[PDB]
């Protein structure tokens, strides 16, 4: 299937260069799979998401995304403007408030949340968690998401935007669960992006147009933003049986586009996420 004038992430995601247009993907596109996205929520009733998103659990007063934040996330997932996946199940955890925070209790508790709740979900492709946070490093956030990862799940985690060695932030700094950089249109690291040897992959960061709340369309910037190409394409690989929650982030460097990303420093993978996909 072809999108033509995608968001650049989309087709950055689908291609051997950068500086094209189009999207590529197979039309199977993630169905049966389903992907969490642990945040401050999903404006499920935006159009984009065709009644395929829904909230399923909160720690606040109310499960809606006050911020915008989760749903321009989930919109990278899933949409079907926006999205990786155009037809993956999304399931929204609102983890942080609608000034964006949370505290690290929380995300521990929302983590082990999903790890239990996917099995009161149908995800027979499998299952995939997109946590587009984090803070100072912490042993124990980085054994929530290791245990998330343990339990069958795809974890995929934004490494920061401190510009700085992702060691020191969480749950960036774990092992065993996917941590995507960002990269910009031009196939640099973007300035923000976090780097380190715990990087396993990167993801398009800069300028990323997807959904909002009040139904509406954005382009904001982050690793936030490259972590959902990450967990959608997971999803969209997973559909197509070509890799396993466990095995997926390696798939997806083993099958990266390798060395063509600037500015990536001594010691960090120099991998652009990439779909691998034949039209």
Do not use: L, W
């Given at each position: 299937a072809a999108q033509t004038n995608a968001p650049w992430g989309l087709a950055r995601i689908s291609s051997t260069s950068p500086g094209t247009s189009t999207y590529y993907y197979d039309e199977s596109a993630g169905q049966g799979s389903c992907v969490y996205v642990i945040?401050?929520?999903?404006?499920?009733?935006?159009?984009?998401?065709?009644?395929?998103?829904?909230?399923?659990?909160?720690?606040?007063?109310?499960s809606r995304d006050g911020n915008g934040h989760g749903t321009h996330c989930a919109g990278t997932v899933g949409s079907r403007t926006y999205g990786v996946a155009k037809k993956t199940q999304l399931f929204g955890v609102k983890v942080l408030d609608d000034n964006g925070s949370g505290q690290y209790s929380?995300?521990?508790?929302?983590?082990?949340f999903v790890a239990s709740d996917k099995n009161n979900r149908n995800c027979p492709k499998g299952v995939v968690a997109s946590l587009s946070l984090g803070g100072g490093y912490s042993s124990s956030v980085n054994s929530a998401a290791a245990r998330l990862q343990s339990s069958g799940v795809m974890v995929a985690v934004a490494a920061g935007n401190n510009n700085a060695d992702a060691r020191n932030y969480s749950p960036a700094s774990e092992?065993?669960?996917?941590?995507?950089?960002?990269?910009?249109?031009?196939?640099?690291?973007?300035?923000?992006?976090?780097?380190?040897?715990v990087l396993?992959?990167?993801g398009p960061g800069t300028d990323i147009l997807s959904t909002w709340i009040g139904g509406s369309t954005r382009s904001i910037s982050g690793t936030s933003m490259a972590t959902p190409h990450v967990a959608g394409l997971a999803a969209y690989l997973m559909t197509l049986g070509k890799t396993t929650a466990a095995s997926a982030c390696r798939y997806i460097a083993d099958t990266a586009n390798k060395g063509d990303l600037s500015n990536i420093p001594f010691g960090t993978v120099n991998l652009l996420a990439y779909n691998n996909y034949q039209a």
């Open positions: 945040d401050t929520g999903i404006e499920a009733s935006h159009p984009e998401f065709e009644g395929r998103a829904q909230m399923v659990k909160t720690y606040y007063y109310s929380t995300i521990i508790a929302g983590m082990d092992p065993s669960v996917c941590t995507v950089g960002a990269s910009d249109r031009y196939d640099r690291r973007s300035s923000f992006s976090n780097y380190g040897s396993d992959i990167f």
